[PDB]
């Protein structure tokens, strides 16, 4: 998503449904490459602590003035006719200047945005339709004409453009929780295993205290911990170096 060769243009924004994986947002937030990292659901630091049902990654190119509009509750041709976030957007907007990557020397014209629409689009809609626009009362029975403008016009991206008319890539991480089990979790920190010493142990959620020792027990390929007559834990299997 972040290192793709060619992004979608804003009218036709790509979505990737990130799920069944561990999401190391520390790689993202520590990156010197980003201009903007606006998180609306939670504070950016805590993203490695959370877990979600899915993380939709919406990707598109817009102008460096328009990146601001991607924030929730914004008014403007990108926020209204191309890509709209809901008032309770529980996610992050991430953006970077890609002028040296998306500005052909004589100008690039591959990226289109909708300048015109009969109504603002609803949150997370996408409108691929090229249907000629009804800008004038006269019905647009033609393929082109006065007041029959093509809704999709194209950006002006040139290397010598100002910050504002240089292309910004954007990705919006829409994180969601549903009634389904959360599968997009963060990377769980794992500090060194120490032995013959009284220590606080957290083995896959199992908070406890005790002296850890190398066991002579032999569990089954499926077992991960053990208990005693009292239904109290007395043995656990190391999740990284299986012992």
């Amino acid at each position: 998503v972040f290192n793709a060769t060619r992004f979608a243009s804003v009218y036709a924004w790509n979505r990737k449904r990130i799920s069944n994986c561990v999401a190391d947002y520390s790689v993202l937030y520590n990156s010197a490459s980003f201009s903007t990292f606006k998180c609306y659901g939670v504070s950016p630091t805590k993203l490695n602590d959370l877990c979600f049902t899915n993380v939709y990654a919406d990707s598109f190119v817009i102008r460096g003035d328009e990146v601001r509009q991607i924030a929730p509750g914004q008014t403007g041709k990108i926020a209204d006719y191309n890509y709209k976030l809901p008032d309770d957007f529980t996610g992050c907007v991430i953006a970077w200047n890609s002028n040296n990557l998306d500005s052909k020397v004589g100008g690039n014209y591959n990226y289109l945005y909708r300048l015109f629409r009969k109504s603002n689009l609803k949150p997370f809609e996408r409108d691929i339709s090229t249907e000629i626009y009804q800008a004038g009362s006269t019905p647009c029975n033609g393929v082109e004409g006065f007041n029959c403008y093509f809704p999709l016009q194209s950006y002006g991206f040139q290397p010598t453009n100002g910050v504002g008319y240089q292309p910004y890539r954007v990705v919006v991480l829409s994180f969601e929780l549903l009634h389904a089990p959360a599968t997009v979790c963060g990377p769980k920190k794992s500090t060194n295993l120490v032995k013959n010493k009284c220590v606080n142990f957290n083995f896959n959620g199992l908070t406890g205290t005790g002296v850890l020792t190398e066991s002579n027990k032999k569990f089954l390929p499926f077992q991960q911990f053990g208990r005693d007559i009292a239904d109290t834990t007395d043995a656990v299997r190391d999740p990284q170096t299986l012992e």
Partner: antibody
Amino acid sequence: EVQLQQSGPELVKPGASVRISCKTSGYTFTEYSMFWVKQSHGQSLEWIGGINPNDDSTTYKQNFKGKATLTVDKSSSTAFMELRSLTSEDSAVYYCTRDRYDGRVVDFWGQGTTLTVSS
Amino acid sequence: IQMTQSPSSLSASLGERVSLICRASQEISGYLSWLQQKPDGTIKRLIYAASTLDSGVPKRFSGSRSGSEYSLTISSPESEDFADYYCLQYASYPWTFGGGTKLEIK
């Protein structure tokens, strides 16, 4: 108030041009198209053409395209019609109008403008 | 490409029914508007989109599509409504109008 402050009654001797304004108000000027009409003292009204004040694009009746020229100025928020080489064909009550797709089509009209070309 | 208004002038008492017609030689797909002109220069829209009206204007106007014909019909005359009437055909460029019809006292 969708008013239309146009130019008052006007005269010039033939073989000469003219200047005709239509100021518009009560709306954001680039949200609507502008068109024009020529109504003679005796003969019917006809459509001269229009300008979209947003996109600076234009369209005309083929008959008038060769003698009309429509313009706007955004900072003045005003429409402006020029007549080039006026003669015995070029005299009427001229009228400005406003248009859109969502129901506001040719509803309100400038008080017109006397463009007599007689001596 | 213009449609034709049946009569050039029409005369009435107050109260009498008044029908105004703008026939069509080609299909305008129902894109048409009715306009009111006073002999002293006052222009204002009556009807659009065939049947849509009732906007800052006397409630009596009606203009439902009559097949091959486009229409205006009124539930009374009035002092100001003794005036000129015009149909606008905008379905296509170039725009055109009917020749107009004048409504008068007897």
